[PDB]
Design a protein around this ligand. Structure first.
Ligand SMILES: O=c1ccn([C@@H]2O[C@H](CO)[C@@H](O)[C@H]2O)c(=O)[nH]1
Length: 251
């Protein structure tokens, strides 16, 4: 229902993406959905070519469900938080199923913005045949914030930022070394996103600057050779996205 459940279909063009071994620039369709209903809030998206990648973020209110104002300090509410990533891949081989679960919260900064924090433990299933499949591996700290800027060009300009800090993974330790000498993978990783979004009644535009540090836990500069000659991984650095979409809702 339009009241709480918000949907959108978008077209996305990316440039200098860094989640994998080699840089990528892709375009694709995307389904988005956000929701907030007393005991549960949710965000997620599914991406598909010009096979299927989806990431959901469902959280459940410990307060609401426990029916016990756990409020404290700047912490308005507490949640059983989840960040689950699924990549179907072209082979049941090169696919991924990642489940982050933990404690989350909403901070009240007394400023005209929203700020949330979450820490998760993770269990890995498929991971493109990597060394850390099927086992509990690594942790993640997710910090995201929403800040309404102003009205611009007839629409509402706002800013969105969120970052995913990953550490404690055993990958990298358990992976080989590169032609390069240094290790191929990484025990940790950071993916920070900065978004400038223009929203009209239905259509919306967003520019996204994203910075990676050992993207996809690929140790930056690792020298590999996939059968076309040697090359160097560029997992640390910037990349960006352009997103145009349409949000549905009956008047
Ligand atoms: O953890 C993630 C999150 C996003 N993406 C890529 O970035 C696109 C949009 O975020 C997704 O379709 C996916 O390919 C990843 O590779 N890994």
């Amino acid at each position: 229902l339009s009241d709480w459940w918000h949907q959108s279909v978008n077209v996305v063009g990316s440039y200098h993406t860094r989640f994998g071994p080699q840089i990528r620039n892709d375009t694709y369709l995307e389904y988005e959905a956000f929701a907030k209903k007393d005991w549960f809030d949710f965000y997620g998206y599914a991406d598909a070519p010009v096979p299927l990648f989806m990431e959901i973020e469902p959280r459940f209110s410990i307060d609401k469900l426990t029916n016990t104002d756990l409020s404290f300090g700047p912490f308005k509410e507490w949640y059983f938080a989840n960040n689950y990533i699924y990549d179907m891949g072209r082979n049941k081989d090169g696919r991924q199923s990642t489940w982050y679960m933990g404690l989350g919260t909403d901070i009240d900064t007394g400023l005209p913005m929203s700020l949330s924090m979450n820490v998760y433990a993770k269990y890995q299933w498929q991971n493109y045949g990597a060394a850390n499949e099927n086992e509990w591996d690594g942790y993640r700290f997710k910090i995201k914030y929403f800040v309404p800027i102003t009205d611009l060009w007839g629409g509402q300009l706002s800013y969105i930022g969120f970052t995913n800090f990953d550490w404690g993974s055993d990958l990298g330790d358990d992976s080989g070394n590169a032609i390069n000498g240094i290790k191929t993978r990484t025990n940790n990783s950071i993916a920070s996103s900065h978004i400038l979004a223009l929203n009209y009644d239905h259509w919306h535009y967003s520019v996204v600057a994203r910075y990676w540090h050992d993207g996809g836990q690929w140790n930056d500069d690792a020298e590999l050779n996939f059968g076309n000659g040697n090359f160097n991984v560029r997992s640390t650095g910037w990349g960006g996205y352009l997103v145009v979409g349409y949000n549905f809702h009956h008047h």
